[PDB]
Amino acid sequence: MEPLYDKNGAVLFGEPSDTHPQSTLKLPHPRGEKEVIVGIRDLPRKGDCRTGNRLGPVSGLFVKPGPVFYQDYSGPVYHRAPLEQFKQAPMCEVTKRIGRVTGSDGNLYHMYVCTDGCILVKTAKREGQDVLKWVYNVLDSPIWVTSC
Ligand SMILES: [Cl-]
């Protein structure tokens, strides 16, 4: 299974892997002041990093299926999309572009939220027509999508 990581960046099982240099997740980075759930209409801004915002502290953007979005999160997270829990799908009608995530295969993906609430990834580069949806979350943990 793709490892989870604790708020200090340490792997909780398995082997650590690096994130893709072009990901919107830039490590090392702090997080986990508070768990702060946000709506899709109130995703945090890069300028909210030092100050927080009116919703609370901010370490970036985190997402899991539901969809559920967070601007900070203290528990275990993915640093890479756990592709074993994704399934091939056609491109959806996208409502929002949320970041660039490393997959558990090491590759870079663009990540989107669909009109149907599904989280979808599409390969950024190389092989054509790769597109997957996040259909299982057996550890009920979010991906750290962006760091501020
Ligand atoms: Cl997994």
Author numbering: 21 to 168
Give the text the authors published on this PDB structure.
Npro is a key effector protein of pestiviruses such as bovine viral diarrhea virus and abolishes host cell antiviral defense mechanisms. The nonstructural protein Npro (N-terminal protease) is the very first protein to be synthesized, releasing itself from the nascent polypeptide chain via a single, autoproteolytic cleavage event (Wiskerchen et al., 1991). Detached Npro is proteolytically inactive but acts as a viral immediate effector to modulate the host cell’s antiviral defenses (Ruggli et al., 2003). The overall structure revealed two compacted folding units: a protease domain (orange) and an interaction domain (I-domain, green).
It lacks 21 N-terminal amino acids and carries a C-terminal hexahistidine tag extension for purification purposes (Achmüller et al., 2007). This tag was autoproteolytically removed following in vitro folding from inclusion bodies (IBs), resulting in autoprocessed Δ(2–21)Npro. To elucidate the detailed mechanism of the single autoproteolytic cleavage, we determined the structures of Δ(2–21)Npro and Δ(2–21)Npro S169P6His to 1.5 Å and 2.0 Å resolution, respectively. A product-like conformation resulting from cleavage further delineates Npro’s proteolytic reaction mechanism, revealing three distinct structural elements in catalysis. Consistent with its proposed role as nucleophile in catalysis, we found the first catalytic element Cys69 to be located close to the scissile peptide bond on a distorted α helix. Intriguingly, Cys69 was locked in a disulfide with the P1-residue Cys168, reflecting a ∼3 Å displacement of the Sγ from the position where it could attack the scissile peptide bond. Rather, His49 polarizes the scissile peptide bond carbonyl oxygen through hydrogen bonding and thus supports formation of the tetrahedral transition state intermediate. We determined 1.25 Å and 1.5 Å crystal structures for solubly expressed and in-vitro-folded Npro, respectively. In neither case could we observe zinc binding at the TRASH motif but disulfide bridging between Cys112 and Cys134.
